[PDB]
Design a protein around this ligand. Structure first.
Ligand SMILES: CCCCCCCCCCCCCC(=O)CSCCNC(=O)CCNC(=O)[C@@H](O)C(C)(C)COP(=O)(O)OP(=O)(O)OC[C@H]1O[C@@H](n2cnc3c(N)ncnc32)[C@H](O)[C@@H]1OP(=O)(O)O
Ligand SMILES: Cc1c(COc2ccc(F)c(F)c2F)oc2cccc(OCCCNCc3cccnc3)c12
Length: 396
């Protein structure tokens, strides 16, 4: 045993069944080959019309083939972790659950895990308890390949979250967000006044800031590992993951999904900071004027300033950098910039006019117990500088 936590069940891979369990009559297992446009496009269609985490929302995600490729074919990916269910007689894809491999540090300990997402069941098949069946089959496939833990997030509370982080939203085009009914008009205020309140300039302020290039990978990999190692729960990137997750490839990528910038110090020419964000659009269900909201999501970032252990200095450096990330998202035509209260986010959220959203994201670990980790928020569910150092991993 151990007073530090660790696995719940020890698994012998040689004792795991090599055949899957039987599904409901009329249905069969499928392994998706996402390198085939036809199957990619079946998955796109199931998610487009059935992946609605909250039917109460006024927006739905709108995927691109590029976002799907970026999200599901990361380094080490295996086709057998893209699991589907088909109707035998029509061949129609009606459920999915997918995993990709990586490594995370959970307090003292490094673990190989899969990140699980895109769990989705067609509306016609809801409430048949298919979920535990999907979960048990991708588990079996991971166990056979030597992976016995997983990490996932959900908007709903399930047994023992390791952490919870609150949604925050910085309007970039306030007038459009007011028109789609995302933002109300405050008491006593006018449109002109909210437009003025949320206005940003068109030029950045941090000297040396430019888009990340392939030749930066090694230095950003190293800055990012040292930066993330300040958090209890963090992702342990390899150099190939930095390449896949952070560096846009225009020859390869139809629609840019990820924006990464570095600051190359002008005096020294060393990279001292970087930040990145990704693009995921939302369709607006019922609106006379707009069809979509283009949302940027804050992803990974780092700064050398964090290692002077001067918190005040770190805060100022992030206010400057994150203000320029807002300016750059706004120039690339995003409507809203989303962030969570993880990493060192509580240092800048409020000051940069991010507003509290109505929603929380919970982190879970499968087959592993560890003490809970602070999610950047206090008792009142507001951001709190004393509640950081916990969650150093972002999920798509
Ligand atoms: C070693 C490797 C191990 C690998 C596996 C590790 C574990 C993975 C766990 C899954 C992780 C999902 C993460 C994401 O994809 C992000 S979260 C994105 C989640 N996707 C969607 O929201 C898509 C839109 N909605 C749907 O399709 C969804 O309706 C459904 C698939 C989420 C649920 O389908 P369903 O309504 O037909 O329910 P059911 O009859 O099949 O079974 C219900 C049981 O499932 C568990 N149930 C309901 N919602 C759940 C959820 N979000 N996560 C987990 N369990 C859930 C519940 O706790 C419940 O339990 P009980 O009744 O027994 O108490
Ligand atoms: C989700 C989400 C929201 C609420 O959504 C929007 C709010 C305002 C908008 F203008 C908008 F377009 C939103 F989508 O605000 C957030 C703030 C921070 C982080 C957020 O989500 C992080 C997790 C996103 N997972 C997206 C995903 C992943 C896999 C499959 N399909 C969708 C969110």
């Amino acid at each position: 045993g151990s007073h530090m936590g660790g696995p719940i069940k020890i698994i012998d891979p040689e004792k795991v069944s090599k055949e899957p369990d039987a599904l409901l009559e009329g249905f069969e297992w499928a392994t998706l080959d996402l390198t085939n446009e036809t199957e990619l496009q079946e998955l796109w269609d199931l998610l487009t019309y059935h992946y609605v985490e909250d039917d109460n929302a006024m927006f739905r995600f709108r995927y691109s083939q590029s976002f799907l490729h970026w999200a599901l074919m990361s380094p080490g990916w295996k086709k057998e972790w893209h699991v589907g269910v088909r109707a035998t007689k029509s061949r129609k894809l009606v459920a999915s659950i997918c995993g990709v491999p990586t490594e995370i540090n959970v307090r003292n300990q490094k673990l190989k895990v899969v990140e699980i997402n895109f769990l989705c069941i067609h509306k016609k098949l809801r409430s048949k308890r298919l979920t535990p069946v999907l979960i048990k089959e991708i588990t079996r496939r991971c166990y056979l390949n030597g992976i016995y833990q997983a990490i996932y997030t959900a908007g709903v509370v399930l047994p023992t979250p390791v952490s919870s982080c609150r949604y925050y939203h910085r309007p970039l085009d306030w007038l459009k967000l007011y028109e789609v009914g995302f933002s109300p008009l405050p008491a006593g205020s006018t449109k002109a006044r909210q437009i003025t309140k949320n206005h940003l300039p068109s030029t950045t302020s941090t000297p040396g800031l430019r888009p990340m290039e392939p030749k930066d990978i090694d230095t950003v990999h190293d800055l990012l590992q040292r930066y993330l190692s300040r958090f209890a729960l963090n992702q342990a990137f390899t150099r190939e993951e930095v390449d896949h997750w952070l560096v846009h490839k225009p020859e390869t990528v139809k629609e840019q999904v990820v924006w990464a910038y570095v600051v190359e110090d002008p005096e020294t020419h060393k990279i001292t900071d970087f930040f990145s964000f990704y693009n995921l659009e939302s369709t607006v269900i019922q609106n006379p004027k707009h069809d979509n909201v283009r949302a940027a999501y804050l992803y990974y970032y780092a700064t050398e300033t964090a290692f002077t252990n001067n918190m005040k200095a770190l805060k100022e450096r992030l206010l400057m950098l994150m203000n320029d990330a807002l300016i750059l998202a706004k120039k690339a035509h995003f409507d809203v910039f989303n962030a969570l209260t993880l990493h060192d986010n509580p240092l800048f959220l409020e000051q940069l006019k991010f507003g509290a959203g109505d929603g929380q994201l919970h982190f879970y670990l499968y087959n592993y117990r560890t003490a809970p980790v602070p999610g950047g928020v206090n008792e009142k569910n507001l951001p709190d500088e004393k509640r950081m150092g916990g969650v150093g991993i972002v999920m798509l």
